[PDB]
Amino acid sequence: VNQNAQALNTLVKQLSSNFGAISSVLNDILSRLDPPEAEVQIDRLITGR
């Protein structure tokens, strides 16, 4: 039971990691920078997650 709790817990907490981007929430990045410069940060976030 501890390996499933610790596995699911790490699985959720990795969403809070930024993975090299400006912020972990997609609304702050999509609501500020333009879409062509922003798509690079989205590809780095998808690859990390």
Next chain:
Amino acid sequence: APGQTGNIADYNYKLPDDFTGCVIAWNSNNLDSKVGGNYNYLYRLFRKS
């Protein structure tokens, strides 16, 4: 520039990201220029979107 903003880029024409050519320019000041300004050509400075 492809995928870059600007006054004429946003409000008139923006180059697509698939553009493979060279940006080639030539000086027309000895032909297209007129005394007191050339009113033949136009441009749209403002637009609602």
